[PDB]
Design a protein around this nucleic acid. Structure first.
Lengths: 317, 968
DNA sequence: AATTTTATCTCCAGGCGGTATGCACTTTTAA
DNA sequence: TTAAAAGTGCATACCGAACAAAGATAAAATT
């Protein structure tokens, strides 16, 4: 399901945090699932270049008429961010539009990773596909394809309570500290911009406008801006699969030491590798910092005099 | 009733009996009986096994003590308990008062002494000793209607003979026995003809030194593990010491070294290395037990006397079926938890004990395991994988070992198979082979096979025997060409996979992985074929759980690809005679597939039309017109054209003797049985089940009906039809209709129609969803009009299966021959897992009769299973009635092979048996059996669903005899 | 009764692994 | 001497995710 704002005050409060946060005028907004468009009305009275991306064709005419009547900058392109750039098939159904064509007709182009931010993406996360969307975004970001093919883009989205706690989990909270937390926190400077109680929104189901638990579940608006130096000499979009496997393996046995996982993952001397990163041999996995994982991976990958370094030949699937 | 610990303790007691570690078993039994809670695990069977183990030693006081414990526990001794005491005295030579007391005690149970022999399955030596002790004081023929003619002695019988002398057959049997006792086969590798270099020498030397270090390390690990498990035995605990004392230390070391060299470079799951190590241990155990027990000599003499039946020069007083002669001449496992635990221990011992230098490049200071334990992730689940060290893999490929290694079962027999006298005994001489292929713990198929009346199974068993007796040999001239292609360049269009070295990035790597798997299967099958190029070999056969028959050697048989069927040919020969060459040419045309719609006359004429191409292809298979590669099956067509050219270039075609097989495939056999059961009138004419001058193809008929519907809809000005213009063809709709017997639904057929449309470039992509939805219902309505009885039968079978599963039982039925069949579909609800240091294996308890029936898979498999059972019954009937007339007969599940000169004869019975097979009321008998079995105990719905059998159509089955294209 | 959910093509030999949780008992350890 | 902390045995739940989907439909599961 999906939810959209039904209150003038809530949309007004969202307007300045969405638009006035970047003091630079020229940032256009790629809003996702406008719904009725009241939030789009707030962003339009704010004066931003709101590019509505409606999932279906039902509410496009209303928004398009509103944008064209006053010559407002409200281009309701028929696309959905959830289904953007699907690998399956060759013919793309218009609701699932290829990223290249969407950016070409939108008018934005590519920028270097070290360069500044091209644009900003806003909206709300899927009600029940938060993990799926997070994994897709992480895969795209680390592979440097799809939306992040053109440049680092903020993703200012509301997320549920449980997913937010699992995302912000740290070695100080090993109960929920998992691979998603590491992969996201190594890439995006996640910071909660706003927090709201879900009873404010209105849930618009398939027919139209669990449930109580969702309403009491506070949604956190989270901003993900990719780090400037995420990709390095050793950590590259081609090698991200090995790193993903290492992180998913090390959390297979959470109540275990890194030194034993290294034996399962590499033929190199576990103690010698652990000595380089300045860590004791008796170190649990859940006590490893997300930056420590990246340092470990880069240390392993930097073996000067050897021929084999890994046991992930893609045969594992 | 069988708990996890109870099965393990019971297997421990039997294993200690087998290896005569009676003090250990006695101590452990005493420990378990000491504790109150631990005693409840013990049952009467454990006590009986323990005392029987002591009886063979003659220790009477131990038997007294165990009887005292049994009496104390409250368990009532049974016949076997007294039998063990009776057989102890015979070896001990005790006084007659004890025998008198033991005999009198049985009066409480009441069963007599001969009742002890009949009820208890005592060993022959045990029976003799019991008879000696008690002396101090005190073949049928199946009468089934369908198989009456096969087993009737009165009449004319012309059972064929092999083409080999008795001396040669006995020498071959000796060779096969020696090879099976060694339990390994060494085969030269077809790939890598030669590699003389310094680096390969260095790799070989390093590999040899490593193998020495590994064997010594594994010997030490074996000794340490045995000592550990022994000290756990002495602490009043279960262990696996006897299961490690069954085999010699060196044998287990050779085992583990062979398994390690058999591990692929891509790793393998732990639950697989566990299952295969346990199975190999059991095979070596039974082979060694038969070797030391002396049954090898009894089998040797009985086989040397039995070979006179099949020998050419030799004769018998009265010719009979090989099973009957074997019977008249004088007739000579572990629970799944134990098997799984034993495999893990060996696998862990293999991974831990072995070690290698980290850097083989130059002269590493440290040692690292050869095998690594990694995790593979599939969605939310994970799998343990044992992957070799990449340096070890590089060493393997650099060594280029010239010899492979095959298990005893993998290689085809060099001597005729043993007759299938019983579900227990058959096929291989020494190694064990189950009749019905199934999962390891599955014991509900063999249970029904054994509990059936002994006469009923005969028709099945004899059939399998014949399929095993058929000789084979390797086609040299075809094999030379295949070897030439495989070694140098390959030809993926033809079927020979390209070498890994030659060029086939992620797409490139996936292509590389499939190509490497295909190249590995080819090295295994071409190496076997090269090894058996100058030897006659046999292939035993066994059934699946429904009734179909498959060869036992998997790596090289006639159920394979084009090359597999191309190399094989009959070892014997028959002269072509009058009609042989016509059938050879018809078979050639059938292999080409160009003239599928034509009558036999047109195919025979077309064969004469293109004779020049056949001669040129046979003479120059690779430097001529190369017409043979254009066929649907290129290698089979090449073999057939070579045979036909040799036949026509001879002085007399009728005198030419041809070893080449000839196939007579059925037309949509599953539909052929649907039509017969339902007596469908319109459907039968479509499936060639009614006489006609031209073959009738169901595929083209369905395509024509769909095209007629398309034109009718286009006349209505509908865009979906207007898009289609000549797109409807048998190619588009063949896959959808061929699986109708399998129970495919609209959803499933739509995916295949979409796949077929996808290659079609002319068709616009936007209409794919709409077109697939259109074609699906058009095809389904076409089949509903042509096949209505088929749909009624499928619905009735599925509904009956669903109701049976809802009632809480699996679906079982008796085939018309008499073989019973039960469906193996149950729900894996409770998790079963074994705790180990390296990893906790998750396994399924295949033999759990407590599990709830799986209603989806039960009701979704009943109709295709029933049709495959009927297909197997028909195949068996034709095989037996062909054998009665001296016919060589081997069948790929519906494709009957025979000699060229014999083809017509086979047809004459192939139809006739069909006519009688469905002459019996199959559906009414099935309904009666299901009512008697699943409804003799909500039952109203089950009874009504089974009592209402679809009404038969209007059709006379006898006209199948005159049908010309029923099987062609 | 009645909304949702989920499977949708048979066989030829097949299954996630870890962590935490409670229970019911024997067993090594406390005075 | 007597009570107990430590330990062994079993079941039992709960967690961990890439990669569209467009209708139909019918039983089973859920309400």
């Amino acid at each position: 399901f999906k939810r959209y704002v039904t209150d003038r005050r809530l949309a007004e409060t969202l307007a300045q945090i969405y638009l006035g946060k970047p003091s630079r005028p020229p940032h256009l907004l790629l809003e996702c699932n406008p719904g009725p468009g009241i939030l789009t009305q707030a962003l339009l009275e704010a004066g931003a270049k709101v590019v509505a991306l409606e999932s279906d064709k039902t509410f496009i005419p209303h928004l398009e008429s509103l944008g064209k009547n006053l010559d407002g900058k409200l281009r309701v392109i028929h696309c959905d961010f959830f289904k953007l750039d699907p690998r399956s098939g060759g013919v793309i159904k218009p609701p699932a539009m290829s990223s290249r064509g969407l950016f070409k007709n939108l008018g934005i182009e590519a920028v270097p990773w070290t360069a500044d931010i091209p644009l900003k993406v806003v909206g709300m996360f899927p009600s029940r596909g938060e993990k799926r969307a997070l994994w897709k975004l992480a895969y795209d970001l680390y592979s440097c394809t799809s939306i992040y093919k053109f440049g680092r883009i903020e993703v200012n989205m509301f997320i549920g309570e449980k997913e937010f706690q699992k995302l912000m989990a740290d070695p100080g909270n090993p109960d929920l500290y998992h691979v998603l937390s590491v992969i996201w926190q190594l890439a995006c400077e996640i910071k909660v911009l706003h927090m709201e109680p879900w009873s404010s929104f209105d849930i618009y189901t398939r027919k139209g406008p669990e449930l109580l638990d969702q309403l009491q579940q506070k949604l956190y608006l989270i901003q993900m801006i990719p780090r400037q130096n995420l990709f390095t000499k050793n950590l590259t979009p081609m090698n991200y699969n090995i790193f993903f496997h290492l992180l998913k393996h090390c959390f297979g046995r959470r109540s275990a030491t890194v030194i034993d996982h290294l034996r399962s993952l590499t033929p190199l001397d576990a103690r010698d590798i652990l000595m380089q990163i300045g860590k004791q041999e008796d170190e649990k996995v859940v006590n490893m910092h997300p930056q420590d994982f990246k340092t470990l991976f880069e240390t392993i990958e930097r073996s000067k005099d050897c021929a084999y370094k890994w046991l992930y030949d893609e045969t594992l699937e | 009733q069988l708990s996890g610990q109870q099965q393990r303790l019971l297997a421990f007691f039997k294993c200690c009996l087998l290896t005569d570690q009676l003090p250990l078993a006695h101590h452990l039994l005493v420990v378990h009986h000491g504790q109150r809670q631990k005693r409840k695990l013990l049952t009467l069977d454990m006590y009986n096994a323990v005392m029987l183990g002591w009886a063979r030693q003659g220790a009477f006081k131990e038997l007294v003590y165990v009887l005292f414990m049994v009496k104390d526990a409250g368990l009532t001794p049974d016949l076997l308990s007294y039998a063990a005491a009776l057989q102890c005295m015979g070896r001990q030579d005790q006084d007659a008062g004890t025998i008198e007391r033991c005999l009198e005690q049985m009066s409480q149970e009441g069963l007599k002494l001969q009742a002890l022999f009949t009820a208890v399955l005592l060993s022959e030596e045990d029976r003799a000793t019991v008879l000696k002790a008690v002396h101090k004081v005190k073949p049928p023929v199946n009468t089934s209607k369908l198989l009456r003619d096969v087993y009737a002695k009165d009449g004319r019988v012309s059972y064929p003979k092999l083409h080999l002398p008795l001396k040669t057959l006995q020498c071959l049997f000796e060779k096969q026995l020696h090879m099976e006792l060694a339990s390994r086969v060494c085969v030269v590798s077809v790939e890598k003809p030669t590699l003389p270099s310094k680096e390969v020498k260095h790799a070989r030397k390093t590999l040899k030194t490593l193998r020495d270090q590994w064997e010594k390390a594994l010997c030490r690990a074996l000794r340490e593990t045995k000592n550990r498990l022994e000290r756990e035995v002495y602490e009043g605990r279960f262990s696996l010491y006897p299961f490690l004392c069954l085999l010699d230390e060196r044998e287990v070391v050779r085992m583990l070294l062979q398994v390690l060299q058999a591990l692929p470079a891509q790793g393998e799951s732990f639950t697989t290395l566990a299952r295969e190590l346990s199975a190999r241990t059991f095979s070596r155990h039974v082979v060694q037990r038969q070797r030391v027990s002396g049954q090898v000599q009894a089998l040797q003499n009985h086989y040397r006397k039995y070979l006179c039946l099949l020998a050419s020069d030799a004769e018998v007083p009265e010719p009979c079926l090989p099973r009957q002669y074997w019977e008249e001449l004088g007739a000579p496992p572990w629970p799944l938890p134990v098997q799984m635990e034993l495999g893990k221990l060996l696998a862990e011992m293999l991974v831990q004990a072995t070690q290698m230098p980290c850097s083989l490049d130059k002269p590493s200071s440290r040692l690292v395991p050869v095998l690594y334990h990694v995790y593979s992730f599939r969605n939310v689940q994970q799998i343990g994988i044992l992957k070799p060290h990449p340096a070890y893999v590089q060493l393997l490929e650099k060594a280029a070992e010239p010899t492979l290694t095959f298990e005893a079962v993998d290689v085809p027999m060099l001597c005729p198979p043993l007759p299938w006298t019983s579900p227990h005994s058959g096929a291989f001489l020494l190694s064990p082979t189950k009749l019905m292929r199934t999962v390891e713990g599955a014991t509900q198929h063999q249970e029904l096979l054994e509990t059936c009346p002994p006469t009923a199974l005969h028709g099945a068993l004899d059939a399998l025997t014949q399929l095993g007796n058929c000789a084979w040999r390797v086609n040299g001239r075809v094999l030379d060409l295949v070897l030439q292609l495989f070694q140098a360049k390959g030809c993926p269009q033809l079927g020979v996979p390209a070498p890994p070295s030659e060029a086939p990035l992620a797409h490139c790597q996936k292509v590389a992985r499939e190509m490497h798997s295909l190249r590995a299967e080819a090295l295994y099958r071409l190496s076997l074929a090269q090894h058996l190029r100058d030897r006659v070999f046999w292939l035993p056969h066994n059934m699946d759980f429904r009734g179909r028959t498959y060869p036992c050697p998997p790596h090289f048989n006639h159920l394979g690809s084009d090359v597999a069927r191309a190399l094989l040919e009959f070892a014997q020969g028959r002269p072509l005679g009058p009609h042989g060459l016509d059938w050879l040419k018809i078979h050639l045309v059938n292999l080409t597939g160009l003239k599928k719609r034509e009558p036999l006359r047109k195919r025979l004429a077309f064969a004469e039309e293109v004779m020049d191409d056949i001669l040129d292809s046979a003479d120059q298979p690779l430097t001529g017109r190369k017409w043979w590669m254009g066929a649907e099956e290129p290698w089979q067509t090449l073999a057939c054209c070579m045979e036909v050219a040799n036949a026509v270039r001879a002085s007399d075609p009728a005198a030419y003797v041809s070893h080449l097989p000839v196939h007579q495939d059925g037309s949509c056999n599953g539909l052929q049985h649907y039509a017969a059961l339902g007596r469908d009138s319109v459907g039968a004419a479509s499936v060639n089940l009614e006489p006609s001058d031209v073959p009738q193809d169901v595929y083209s008929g369905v395509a024509a009906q769909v095209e007629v519907f398309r034109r009718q809809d286009a006349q209505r000005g509908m865009r979906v039809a207007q898009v289609l213009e000549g797109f409807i063809t048998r190619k588009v709709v063949k896959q959808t209709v061929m699986t109708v017997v399998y129970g495919v639904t609209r959803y499933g057929g739509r995916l295949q129609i979409e796949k077929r449309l996808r290659e079609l470039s002319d068709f616009p992509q936007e209409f794919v969803w709409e077109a697939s939805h259109y074609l699906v219902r058009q095809v389904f309505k076409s089949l509903q009009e042509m096949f209505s009885g088929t749909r009624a039968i499928q619905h009735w079978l599925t509904e009956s299966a669903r109701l049976i599963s809802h009632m809480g039982s699996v679906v079982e039925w008796v085939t018309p021959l008499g073989v019973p069949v039960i469906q193996p579909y149950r729900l894996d609800s409770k998790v079963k897992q074994i705790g180990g240091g390296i990893q906790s294996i998750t396994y399924t308890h295949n033999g759990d009769i407590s599990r709830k029936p799986n209603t989806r898979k039960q009701k979704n498999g009943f109709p295709p299973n029933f049709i495959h059972s009927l297909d197997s019954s028909h195949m068996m009937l034709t095989a037996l009635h062909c054998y009665r007339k001296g016919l060589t007969f081997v069948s790929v599940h519906d494709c009957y092979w025979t000699h060229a000169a014999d083809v017509s004869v086979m047809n004459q019975v192939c139809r006739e048996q069909f006519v009688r097979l469905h002459s019996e009321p199959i559906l009414q008998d099935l309904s009666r059996f299901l009512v008697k079995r699943f409804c003799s105990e909500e039952a109203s719905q089950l009874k009504e669903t089974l009592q209402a059998v679809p009404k038969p159509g209007a059709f006379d089955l006898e006209q199948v005899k005159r049908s010309t294209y029923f099987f062609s």
